[PDB]
């Protein structure tokens, strides 16, 4: 988990992207229901960007931004 690189581009895409600077909790545009796809496949790309996997306290309920984000930066490569 490099982190930084691929949790940019920026989100990509800005894809899975804090648009909000608002605190994990809220998510790529997600945390009332979002688009699934969006989130599976990058989640699927982080998963492989960042080469590991994801116990929940690590993950703090990764709703998918800050706190896979905060987790990758907890993680590191």
């Not at 581009?9 to 605190?23: F, W």
């Not at 709703?63 to 907890?74: E, M, S």
């Amino acid at each position: 988990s490099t982190i930084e690189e691929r949790v940019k581009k920026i989100i990509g895409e800005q894809l899975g992207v804090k648009q909000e600077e608002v605190t994990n909790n809220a998510s790529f545009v997600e945390d009332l229901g979002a688009d699934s796809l969006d989130t599976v496949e990058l989640v699927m790309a982080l998963e492989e960007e960042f080469d590991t996997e994801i116990p929940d306290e690590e993950a703090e309920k990764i709703t998918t931004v800050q706190a896979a984000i905060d987790y990758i930066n907890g993680h590191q490569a």
